[PDB]
Amino acid sequence: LTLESLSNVKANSYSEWITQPNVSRTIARELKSFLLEYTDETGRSVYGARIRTLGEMNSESLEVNYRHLAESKAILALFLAKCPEEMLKIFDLVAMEATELHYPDYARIHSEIHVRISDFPTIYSLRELRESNLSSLVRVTGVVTRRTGVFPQLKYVKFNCLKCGSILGPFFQDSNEEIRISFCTNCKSKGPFRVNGEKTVYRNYQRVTLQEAPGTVPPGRLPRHREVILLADLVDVSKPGEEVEVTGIYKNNYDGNLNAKNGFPVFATIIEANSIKRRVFSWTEEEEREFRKISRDRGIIDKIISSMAPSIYGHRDIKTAVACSLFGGVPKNVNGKHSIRGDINVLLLGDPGTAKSQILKYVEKTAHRAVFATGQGASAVGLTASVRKDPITKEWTLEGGALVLADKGVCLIDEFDKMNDQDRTSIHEAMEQQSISISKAGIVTTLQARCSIIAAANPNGGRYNSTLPLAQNVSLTEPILSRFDILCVVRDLVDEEADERLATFVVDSHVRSHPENSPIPQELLMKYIHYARTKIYPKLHQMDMDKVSRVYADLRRESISTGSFPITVRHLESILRIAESFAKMRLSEFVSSYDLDRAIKVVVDSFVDAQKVSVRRQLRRSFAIYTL
Amino acid sequence: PLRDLDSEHVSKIVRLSGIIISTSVLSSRATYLSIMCRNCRHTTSITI
Amino acid sequence: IHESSKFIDQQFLKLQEIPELVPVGEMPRNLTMTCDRYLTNKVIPGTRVTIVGIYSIYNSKSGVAIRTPYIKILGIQSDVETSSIWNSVTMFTEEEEEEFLQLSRNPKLYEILTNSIAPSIFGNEDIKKAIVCLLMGGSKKILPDGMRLRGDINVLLLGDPGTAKSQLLKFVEKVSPIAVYTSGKGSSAAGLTASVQRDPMTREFYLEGGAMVLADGGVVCIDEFDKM
Amino acid sequence: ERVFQISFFNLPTVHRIRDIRSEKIGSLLSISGTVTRTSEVRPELYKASFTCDMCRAIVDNVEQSFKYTEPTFCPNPSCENRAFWTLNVTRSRFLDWQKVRIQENANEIPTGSMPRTLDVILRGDSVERAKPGDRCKFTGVEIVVPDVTQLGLPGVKPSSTLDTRGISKTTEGLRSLGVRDLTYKISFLACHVISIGSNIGERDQEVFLNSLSSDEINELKEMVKDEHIYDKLVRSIAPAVFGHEAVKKGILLQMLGGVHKSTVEGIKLRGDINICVVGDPSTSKSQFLKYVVGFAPRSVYTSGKASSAAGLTAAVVRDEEGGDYTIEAGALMLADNGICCIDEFDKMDISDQVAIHEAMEQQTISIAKAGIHATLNARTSILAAANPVGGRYNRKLSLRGNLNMTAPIMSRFDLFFVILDDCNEKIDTELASHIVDLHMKRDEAIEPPFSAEQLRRYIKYARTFKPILTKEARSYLVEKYKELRKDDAQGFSRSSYRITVRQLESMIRLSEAIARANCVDEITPSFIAEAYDLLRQSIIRVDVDDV
Ligand SMILES: Nc1ncnc2c1ncn2[C@@H]1O[C@H](COP(=O)(O)OP(=O)(O)OP(O)(O)=S)[C@@H](O)[C@H]1O
Ligand SMILES: Nc1ncnc2c1ncn2[C@@H]1O[C@H](COP(=O)(O)OP(=O)(O)OP(O)(O)=S)[C@@H](O)[C@H]1O
Ligand SMILES: Nc1ncnc2c1ncn2[C@@H]1O[C@H](COP(=O)(O)OP(=O)(O)OP(O)(O)=S)[C@@H](O)[C@H]1O
Ligand SMILES: [Mg+2]
Ligand SMILES: [Mg+2]
Ligand SMILES: [Mg+2]
Ligand SMILES: [Zn+2]
Ligand SMILES: [Zn+2]
Ligand SMILES: [Zn+2]
Secondary structure, three states: OOHHHHHOOOOOOHHHHHHOHHHHHHHHHHHHHHHHHOOOOOOOOHHHHHHHHHHHOOOOEEEEEHHHHHHHOHHHHHHHHHOHHHHHHHHHHHHHHHHHHHOOOHHHHOOOOEEEEEOOOOOEOHHHOOHHHOOEEEEEEEEEEEEOOOEEEEEEEEEEEOOOOOEEEEEEOOOOOOOOOOOOOOOOOOOOEEEOOOOOEEEEEEEEEEEOOOOOOOOOOOOOEEEEEEOHHHOOOOOOOOEEEEEEEEEEOOOOOOOOOOOOOEOOEEEEEEEEEEOOOOOOHHHHHHHHHHHOOOOHHHHHHHHOOOOOOOOHHHHHHHHHHHHOOOOEEEOOOEEEOOOOOEEEEEOOOOOHHHHHHHHHHHOOOEEEEEOOOOOOOOOOOEEEEOOOOOOEEEEOHHHHHOOOOEEEEEOHHHOOHHHHHHHHHHHHHOEEEEEEOOEEEEEEOOOEEEEEEOOHHHOOOOOOOHHHHOOOOHHHHHOOOEEEEEOOOOOHHHHHHHHHHHHHHHHHOOOOOOOOOHHHHHHHHHHHHHHOOOEOOHHHHHHHHHHHHHHHHHHHHHOOOOOOHHHHHHHHHHHHHHHHHOOOOEOOHHHHHHHHHHHHHHHHHOOOHHHHHHHHHHOHHHHO | OHHHOOHHHOOOEEEEEEEEEEEOOOEEEEOEEEEEOOOOOOEEEEEO | OHHHOOEEEEEEEEEEOOOOOOOOOOOOOEEEEEEEHHHOOOOOOOOEEEEEEEEEEEOOOOOOOEOEEEEEEEEEEEOOOOOOOOOOOOOOOHHHHHHHHHHHOOOOHHHHHHHHOOOOOOOOHHHHHHHHHHHHOOOOEEOOOOOEEOOOOOOOOOOOOOOOHHHHHHHHHHHOOOEEEEEOOEOOEOOOOOEEEEOOOOOOEEEEEOHHHHOOOOEEEEEOOOOO | OOOOOOOOOOOOOOEOHHHOOHHHEOOEEEEEEEEEEEOOOEEEEEEEEEEEOOOOOEEEEEEOOOOOOOOOOOOOOOOOOOOOEEEEEEEEEEEEEEEEEEEOOOOOOOOOOOOOEEEEEEEHHHOOOOOOOOEEEEEEEEEEEEOHHHHHOOOOOOEEEOOOOOOOOOOOOOOOOOEEEOOEEEEEEEEEEEEEOOOOOOOOHHHHHHHOOHHHHHHHHHHHHOOOHHHHHHHHOOOOOOOOHHHHHHHHHHHHOOOOEEOOOOOEEOOOOOEEEEEOOOOOHHHHHHHHHHHOOOOEEEEOOOOOHHHHOEEEEEOOOOOOEEEEEOHHHHOOOOEEEEEOHHHOOHHHHHHHHHHHHHOEEEEOOOOOOEEEEOOOEEEEEEOOOOOOOOOOOOHHHHOOOOHHHHHOOOEEEEEOOOOOHHHHHHHHHHHHHHHHHHHHHOOOOOOHHHHHHHHHHHOOOOOEEOHHHHHHHHHHHHHHHHHHHHHHHHEOOOOOHHHHHHHHHHHHHHHHHOOOOEEOHHHHHHHHHHHHHHOOEOOOOOO
16 A cells, blocks of 8 residues: 555544554555665664664564654654554664565574664653553653562463363563463363463563652642563563653553442553663773773862862862772771771761761762761661561562661761761771671571761850860760771851851852752762772882871870870771772872871861860871871 | 673573572472373373 | 372572662562472571572563563572571580590680680670680579579670770670671661560561570670660 | 533532432532542543454443443354453553542541542543642532442441342253342542642743733732832731741741752752741740641641651552552642641651651652652642740750750751740730730731732742842852851850851741842842841840849
């Protein structure tokens, strides 16, 4: 037939029209022609290149643009829009033949090609779906809330007869309904036939709950939700909590005896997803060369610190501590017996309104594995490990908590002072031995909790006191204060010049944020940080020894002079650990004397800031050589 | 990995890792059972 | 006919992905597994295992043709072996028996054992000697009147922060055949002493755990002993 | 064929939810009620298509009378069996279906009774015209729905036996019969839905002005040209309250609010203004909240003790011990893009305070209970009334000493209004005269410059404007923030609470609200100065005993 004759319809509906064999083979021929000959008048066929790429990477998905099919064969685009199931089946057979022409043995390897329609023009929200959209193609936006596990769904079903024992040839399984068998062809009987899963072929199946994104929801109304079924190649592509656009067939669930609660013949609906599009710390070979180029620069550490938290103004010491915590040191197990922690723990103790929460959020966006937890609030991952039974599923799960989940990563704890006893024991154990022991519900085990910790806390009474020292200013007991490497005390002393630039920064953010209206870019910095944590592992040599013992001996006796809380071995280890993170920002295999001096500066500045006002003025002049 | 299991692994030997969270009690399955007809008294054995 | 029928043992296990590598917003995913005969009772819950098995199919009476996956266990490998009185081994080969006898004939066995205790800790030689004495224990006495005399040695280390007493506790935890390291208030989800709770399925009393009981016949290292 | 629906409206009488009687079943009738829960729009089997199981020929356009039916005619001559069919969902014809749950209105509730609910079904174009938390008038038919719940109720329940009098039988051998229960509950099927205002008496301004007629646009613009419009507005807020002009200013700015801004990072800047009123007992703090809930649209009034964490944000509800779970919106969702009035905030326990400040920072409500995972909007302003520790407000202590609320509660309030009771002869004399005059004269002792209807019209007009800062405005704002910080630095402990950056952001928000009050698109430095003065006299100086 012809395209104009395809536009005219003889059957009652479009589905029965496409169902006719002459019309179906005409559609298949026209779709094969369109797949073969289509070009953008640039001398290149995009679909031939796509077929070659999917053949070379061994993929069962062919991404087909809807605009290309619409401009060339408008009636076929209309047929795909209104009756997508059988149209997609036909064009899947067409694309399978097109791939077969390119690769002859691709059929025995895969035997299935799924066509993913891209750039469907009309976009529906979840609240405006009606029955007119049923059995039609729809493109909707939404945020994924939860996803099930991947299940095997029958694809090529193979049966065996109980009377004879013979295995009867495979049948394709429709995804819409269950298929059954009534004849044996060997016994010529209608006897009981059993499915054997050994010879049956399966495809992946997943269910995803999609809700309307809260920004698009009208004010008084609730966000609507739908169930989206993801097939074999589409499973586990959408992490819960991310916003996607799904194109698929809007259809009805079939359930026994409908719904007895309503009193009306009411059907549940789903979206059978044809395609998923999303609205990664992988570096290429060129990106590694660019990393070496930017790390060769002398002011790489200054530039990294300045790139820390662009929304935060004027807090250079906090940004330096964040840079050390993100880059981290080298954990070392010497001869098996003795273990030394190699990740920096930072505690931001500050008065309210000092933007600690924004810093924690920046670290969460920046770090590879960052887990946010809070002592005061409830809508967060808990810090304590547990074994819990689902009240619906009746199936137990072991959760390690935020500290175990942030293993080889970052744990960001907001409201550090407001914990209960169980959380305090959990973070105490995690900072003590980097593990969490659980003996509950028959499970006795130890989970690895080698997580760097960045915490935010407030002083007692809502304001820091300079005359009192650090231990009196917090409810935190001394052993949990000792485990932190960097202790950033932040107070907003009223200085007119500082308040002027801070207010100017806030107002300029407000003005640029209005709808009617040196730093490394963050995408590059994120991969640079991930590369440094897994590739460098800086080391130090034996001739650098004579200086660190020199300064540390000059440290402790000064702490003897004023009677403050002492410099222990932990301060020396914090010096040697922070220096291994400064050599990671330089991407250097050795730890230099300049990185070591900068680490000494950070540790001494954190020690002096933690003192009372009487001790601080004496300690500042004695260590002015190290602070510079 | 447990979440990288696929329909391509169905009815095939897989090597995989994890933590065991529960072990049930031991059930008793029949390997050899001798059976007798109720009224016929025909005696048969089934080996599993 | 049950008196002439034969039976074996079947066990259901549940394997979960390790909680260290789980997406933050997702419940960890698990699988039901079946073992039989000599593969049963070879693993306790909490053990990290490698498993060779058949990824298999069953139908449970959410999709027209959906099957729940499960594993028929063919082999279990315990990556690490937990230490307790029940899992302790009493058998000794002849070569290690003779090798340990060559240790006892050394007049400086005491010195080399004290030097082997925490080599990366400077000083505290008396504490290291006391740790050697604590690790051995003493002769236990059971008397004809029934009054039991203990032989285990308890050692307290009071002192200033940053003096490697916690590292000594960790080293004793590592070197002891059976050892549990906890704080005074216990662990994150493992209590101190003994916990007697009810069975999660049958509601009957059982011993959930505890530091001092799990390390029976061993050493309990209690850090921050004052806060309890 | 197109499905046509007739919607009747303007019935002479509207019936209360408790006036529903069995005599009106199958009759056109009007009810009013508060929408508490709404369901997803679902397809309903209107005209089904079946195939006979052994004929295997298609039939269509079989009408469905409520519960699911199958035909017994089968005009195909192939079969001799009527009962056996199967239904295909693809060829079937469907309709819009929504079940919305409505509740008795507060004034309609009898003296000691609890409110009772009713499930009303919307079909066709009437779906989604009902929203949780508003008062709707439904016109439709009173229908009856099968109910298995009434099994254990006392009284004789009607049953339905098949009559066997004209059936010839033989006792040939080889006596079972089927009986079904007739138990029902009354439901409503509404053809027309109209939303009455939740008050006693759409973002684009071009859309809003088209709804008003030209004559009412004339008084709207006439209020616009008034040079003393701010004084009229602040005097028209809560005329029952005598004095307290600063609280009326703050409440007017809360009803106007600020603009919601989002940066390139993705963080959201809150435009809602939160007010907390603290002070001595019987200083008319509850009068402000009762005025706001009765006046402002999409506003709820809650007590601190009577509230719950699920009742304030959202609750997952078990229904009829059935496997389905539902979500009912809490107080902050019912007041989304409105004001939630929380009286006796100090009496609220710590868990509910945590659950509500989570919505105060995040502007959202997270649900992870049971099998329901959802994020809901909570873009609501908060007007709270609190009592200090010990009843009286202590002059010696700070603001944090008097209040039992958490620091996350206290930091997010833009304005704290401390109303102190001082016994002076004059002010007590005019206050007593005003209150007794209210009791004597009822409505005509209230003389606002603007009526409630025109005030709501002006506020709805003013909310369409989105003010922007000017070049001089930014510099004046920075200088005002520096003056605030220097004043606290000089005051030390004499200040009630210290100015941080959050107070600068609240001053920006208040300046935007003031610019909305005067219906200007650009913020004047005078408006910033007025916001500065309001925030300055919001803070009171702490008295210190002499040494
Ligand atoms: N130096 C700064 N640079 C930029 N913004 C700042 C700065 N200091 C404060 N802010 C702003 O002030 C506000 C403080 O909010 P949060 O950081 O959430 O509160 P916080 O600092 O965590 O203190 P809490 O929560 O009361 S203990 C935010 O809007 C910040 O953007
Ligand atoms: N003599 C030492 N030799 C080697 N490392 C030492 C020595 N003294 C302290 N350290 C190190 O100092 C760090 C502090 O650990 P510990 O001293 O064990 O903590 P602790 O302060 O003794 O325990 P507390 O009292 O509960 S805080 C560890 O990294 C030790 O390796
Ligand atoms: N300034 C005022 N103008 C008019 N009526 C007032 C004024 N102050 C008090 N009243 C009346 O005194 C009574 C106080 O009622 P409320 O508003 O409940 O007091 P309150 O300020 O909320 O104090 P608490 O916290 O409830 S004890 C009411 O009858 C008010 O009408
Ligand atoms: Mg904060
Ligand atoms: Mg210690
Ligand atoms: Mg009151
Ligand atoms: Zn057969
Ligand atoms: Zn027999
Ligand atoms: Zn028929």
